Every structure is written in structure tokens, then in C-alpha cells.
Design a protein around this ligand. Structure first.
Ligand SMILES: *[C@@](O)(c1nc2ccccc2s1)[C@H](C[C@@H]1CCNC1=O)NC(=O)[C@@H]1[C@@H]2[C@H](CN1C(=O)[C@@H](NC(=O)NC(C)(C)C)C(C)(C)C)C2(C)C
Ligand SMILES: *[C@@](O)(c1nc2ccccc2s1)[C@H](C[C@@H]1CCNC1=O)NC(=O)[C@@H]1[C@@H]2[C@H](CN1C(=O)[C@@H](NC(=O)NC(C)(C)C)C(C)(C)C)C2(C)C
Lengths: 306, 306
């Protein structure tokens, strides 16, 4: 029993972190095989942040300008290339700890674990979700750029985020491993704003299921409803519309608890309209939306990894 | 910026997990050097749970009755001994991944990371706190026994918990690495109850500091108070008394924010008496007490590890 904000074991990723320095700028890089991936603005100085011309900046750099350290070991950069917003530094040595991996661009609502690093060294790990507005509510300080987000599928590590910046609202933005930003952001110091955020309805339902699985049933009722009537209420509260795909996705949990998805939607409807009334669900006073239906199954069934 | 429930990187611990089987019972073990540590009830059958006589049960076991697997590798048990509630199985091979470690018995209020395992394989990681009543609010299912709790101090891993059981209230209990239970519990199926739990006042204050560091200042006031007057209010709300030691411990955070500890105590006093009023602190609607003053510093300063 029990329910926690569970992160994936970080071992396979820790072996891939390195330190990249170019001048006075130091940040993290991901070393897979003979390549080190890192944000391209590692070549910028405080003077270039406002409106950097990356092609130019990079053309004035030579392989010796890049100091890459893997622990006490220094890696020799034998080539470099820029792919969108990331730098790919070719090194003379293949990482012997390279796990089986793949790069993926996730969709909003999906969750992943973050290995926060500083100077090539892992400081900590936590779970978070890609918000509908393409930001994440992270925990990052100076020197954190380069830190990656990932998910583990059996024996494979799926990298899906590389950290780049913080917004005025204290939320964060980054890219996928191919250098493509998630959201409408750019890597330059110009006014940028994250859009209006909304609640991931499908995750909230998965969480209510987790609650039932763990014994909290006070919010349940006999009522029911339709996808149509539900979504009308949802929009009034800044919740993401619910689709048949989401309904099908919640299937396993509906089957496990015997509570029909549309029935659970009625419970939620009432929770939105009348609040929680000083009561809690799974130790919380707010409806949590950073647990995907799969996260719930994984934690309430005991799925392990290599 | 940002604040998350951050766990320690699990890499160093993942290398030490193994699978221990005795008959039909399988659970996890911790392999350090040439020894495998695991809960002693791995030798029990469903028939022995009610009132097991461990000395007897163990006297009827021989080294070949213990199957220990480290991945695809099988480890030969060349000896065994029982230390309080844990079994120490001597093996023919020293773990080559053994990190620099130490065993510690923590005190209530302290936090640590848990590496939940099943069949010797890491399922996930999360941070939790040893409650004043000697239990933890974990996330454990059948097969989880053996999973350990730890903290990382620079380059050293400090093991402080080994999981053993779940209480009717859905909370958990275990021991230190020397087999001594935390709390008044025993490893047998007899009626046992966890005591009344209370809130870790000092952690709540550290969290309010984290809130100020992150920009949430709505709960602050000009008022102040004395340790005496505060503790009177606290007891009425089931909060742990506050001591001068706690005040000294919160020093660095008081210095960093410029808000005096006794001033922060006044803010808290008001929060207890008038509630939060539909407002939140660091994204929460309840006062969080699973962040120690050190956790806050570590996350708001960027402390890393080997
Ligand atoms: C990274 O660790 C980097 N630091 C440097 C330092 C020199 C050159 C390149 C880089 S990348 C850091 C992470 C930040 C620190 C606090 N929280 C984080 O997540 N990111 C940055 O410093 C980016 C870099 C420069 C600005 N920047 C920021 O995050 C700005 N935010 C900002 O300008 N935001 C707008 C929305 C207005 C664009 C602050 C937080 C003010 C430092 C790049 C975008 C190139
Ligand atoms: C461990 O993984 C173990 N499983 C076995 C199976 C056979 C022999 C030995 C062991 S240790 C498991 C973890 C549990 C599972 C659910 N959540 C957990 O944390 N622990 C146990 O099975 C312990 C074992 C037997 C009972 N037990 C329990 O946790 C009971 N709880 C219980 O009896 N609680 C009282 C307070 C009434 C004592 C349940 C949850 C009912 C299985 C030992 C204490 C020897």
C-alpha cells in the first residue's frame, strides 16, 4: 500500500553525465557512445545572450576550446556540430557505461524523471510532468543546464528532455535530445512568456483511481455522466478536455477497481463544483495531475527494470 | 528556482541489490563486500508468521537452502548468522561495486531516500521521513522486503533502513542495518499499533523558509513571539515541541532570508490558528513536514555528490 511521487532509478543515467566548459561557461553534457550532447549556448558569453548568432559564434570555435571532463578523466574533442539548439561534440572515447537508449519527444501530460546535475555531478532526482503549456515545474539553479529528463522502458533508457532555462514565473523550459524546444521558446534573452496552463484531466482521474486502490473512497458517488456533460464543466475550471482515447487508457484501472470511468468523472465533477471541504485524497488537499495512468499501474503493481 | 521532493541519486545502491530465496519465499538483500544483508523472516513459511522461533527455524537451515542471485549471477552462500532481526549471509564473492558506506540509526524527523526493489531489481526511488511514531509513509507491495533507505554524504552512502512490514493503517516499519527495529514493533504477525503521529515542527519551518527563498511571502507578518508561547500553541495542534537546538539548526536559513526564526514561528502560529484560507505555499495546501533544514539548503544551494 501507499502512494508516492516515485522517480525512476537514476543509475543508468549517472554514468553518462559529464562537464563541458567553453571559456568561463560550464554546464553539463550527456555522453553516449563517442558523442557528448549539451546546450549550444555553452559557447556564449554574457555579452552574447541578448541576440546571439550561433552559426557565427560556433565558426570562431575550435575543438580545443571545449574542455570535457568525465570525473577526473578528460575527454578529447575531435569534432563538433550543431543540431538545432544542441551541440554534438565528438570525442575520442566511447562511454563504456553507455546503456541501451533512445531519444523521444514526449507530449504534454507525460511524466519523466529528472537527474539534476551540477558540474557533471548528480545532485538529485525527481519526477515531474510536461505541462500543457510546454513548461515544467522543476528545481534548477545556476549550472543546472545540460541536466536531462528520462523514462525507463524495461532495459531501455528514453531521454526526452535537456534543460536550458528558467522563466520569470519560476518554471522551466528545455528541448528534446535533438535540440528542438518543447513549446514556443528560444535560447536567447528576449521577452518570452509561457502560455496559460491547465490541469491534465486524465492524470487527475488516474490519481483518483490510485486513491480508491489505496482505500480513499469518500469522493465516490452513485451518479454518472457523459463525456459531453463532463467536458462542459471541465472547461469552466481550466481542465483539459477528455477524449475517448483517455477513456480507453484508463481502462485497466477501471477494471481493477470496478468503478467505470464515466462514474469516476461524476465524482470529479462534484469535486470541482463543491471543493474538497477540508478533506484530503492520498494525503493531499489539491487534485494532483502529475501521475499518468501508467505511473499508477506501475506503482500499484510493482513493475521493475534492468 | 523551484522546489521538489528530491531523492538522492540511486546509482551507488542499485549495484548492491540482490535476490534472496529460501524455499518459496523471495525478497531483497543488500550485498556489501562479501556479505548479503536481508530480513530474517525470509526463512519463514506462512505457517511460522504467527509466533516464529527464529533460533530454531535457523538451526534447521543449511547454506544451500539460500539461493542468492545478483542478476544472472548466482552467489554461493558459505555461511550465515542472525543479528537481531536481520540475516547476514556470507558469500564467496565480494561485490566489486561496493561503494564507500556506513550504517546509521537515524532519529525521527530525519529524511532519507528509498530504493523500492522487487526480485533484486530496482522499481523506483522516493524521499520520505521517519515519523515521530517510528513509521514511514511508504509505497511497498508484496516482495518489497529487503529494500533499503539511505542518505548520501559526499562520497559515502549511509544506509539507515531496511523494509520489513506494513501496518493496518497502510504505513510501514523496518529496521536499521543492524537488525534493530525503529519503534516498538516485532517481526511476527501479532496485533501491533503505531502510536499517535505528530507534525515535525522544525521541518515545517524549514519549508516556510524554502517558500520565502522561492518568493512565497504571503504568510509572513511583523509579529514575533517566544519559544515558550509558541510551544503552547503547537501542543494544541499536535506539533512537536520546538527546542533551542532546532532554533540553532535553522540558523543558515534565517541568515539567508533575513527573517528571524522566532519571527517565522509567529507566522506559523497564525497559520495554525487561522488556516491557509484557500491559499497555497510552494504549490501545497497543507503544511509540509518531510523537508529537513538540511534538505532545504541542499536544494536551494546546489550540493552535489560523487
Ligand atoms: C543554465 O545552467 C545556463 N547557464 C549559462 C551561463 C552562461 C552561458 C550559457 C548558460 S546555460 C541556466 C539555468 C537557469 C539558472 C536558474 N534556473 C535555470 O533554469 N540557464 C540560463 O542561464 C539561461 C541562458 C540565458 C538566460 N537564461 C535564463 O535561464 C535566465 N532566464 C531568462 O533570461 N528568461 C527569459 C524568459 C527572459 C528569456 C535567468 C534565470 C535570468 C538566468 C539563456 C537563455 C541563453
Ligand atoms: C515483505 O516483502 C515480506 N514478505 C514475506 C513473505 C513471506 C515470508 C516473509 C516475508 S517479508 C512484506 C512487505 C509488505 C507487503 C505489503 N506491504 C508491505 O510492506 N512484509 C510482510 O509480508 C510482513 C511479514 C509477515 C506479515 N507482514 C506484513 O506486512 C503483513 N502485516 C502485518 O501482519 N501487520 C501486523 C501489524 C498485524 C503485524 C501484511 C501487510 C498483512 C502482509 C511478517 C511481519 C513476518
Amino acid at each position: 500500500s501507499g502512494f508516492r511521487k516515485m522517480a525512476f532509478p537514476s543509475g543508468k543515467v549517472e554514468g553518462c553525465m559529464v562537464q563541458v566548459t567553453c571559456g568561463t561557461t560550464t554546464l553539463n553534457g550527456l555522453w553516449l557512445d563517442d558523442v557528448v550532447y549539451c546546450p549550444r549556448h555553452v559557447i556564449c558569453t554574457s555579452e552574447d545572450m541578448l541576440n546571439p548568432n550561433y552559426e557565427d559564434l560556433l565558426i570562431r570555435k575550435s575543438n580545443h576550446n571545449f574542455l570535457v571532463q568525465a570525473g577526473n578523466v578528460q575527454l578529447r574533442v575531435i569534432g563538433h556540430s550543431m543540431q538545432n539548439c544542441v551541440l554534438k561534440l565528438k570525442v575520442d572515447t566511447a562511454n563504456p557505461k553507455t546503456p541501451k537508449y533512445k531519444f523521444v519527444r514526449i507530449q504534454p501530460g507525460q511524466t519523466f524523471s529528472v537527474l539534476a546535475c551540477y558540474n557533471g555531478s548528480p545532485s538529485g532526482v525527481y519526477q515531474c510532468a510536461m505541462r500543457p503549456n510546454f513548461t515544467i515545474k522543476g528545481s534548477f539553479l545556476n549550472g543546472s543546464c545540460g541536466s536531462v529528463g528520462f523514462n525507463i522502458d524495461y532495459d531501455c533508457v528514453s531521454f526526452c528532455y535537456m534543460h536550458h532555462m528558467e522563466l520569470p514565473t519560476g518554471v522551466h523550459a528545455g528541448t528534446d535530445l535533438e535540440g528542438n524546444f518543447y513549446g514556443p521558446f528560444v535560447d536567447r534573452q528576449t521577452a518570452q512568456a509561457a502560455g496559460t496552463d491547465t490541469t491534465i484531466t486524465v492524470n487527475v482521474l488516474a490519481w483518483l483511481y490510485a486513491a480508491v486502490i489505496n482505500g480513499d473512497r469518500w469522493f465516490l458517488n452513485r451518479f454518472t455522466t457523459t463525456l459531453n456533460d463532463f467536458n462542459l464543466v471541465a472547461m469552466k475550471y481550466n481542465y483539459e478536455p477528455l477524449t475517448q482515447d483517455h477513456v480507453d487508457i484508463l481502462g485497466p484501472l477501471s477494471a481493477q477497481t470496478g468503478i467505470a470511468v464515466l462514474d469516476m468523472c461524476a465524482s470529479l465533477k462534484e469535486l470541482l463544483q463543491n471543493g474538497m471541504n477540508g478533506r484530503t485524497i492520498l494525503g493531499s488537499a489539491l487534485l494532483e495531475d502529475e501521475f499518468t495512468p501508467f505511473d499508477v499501474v506501475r506503482q500499484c503493481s510493482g513493475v521493475t527494470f534492468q
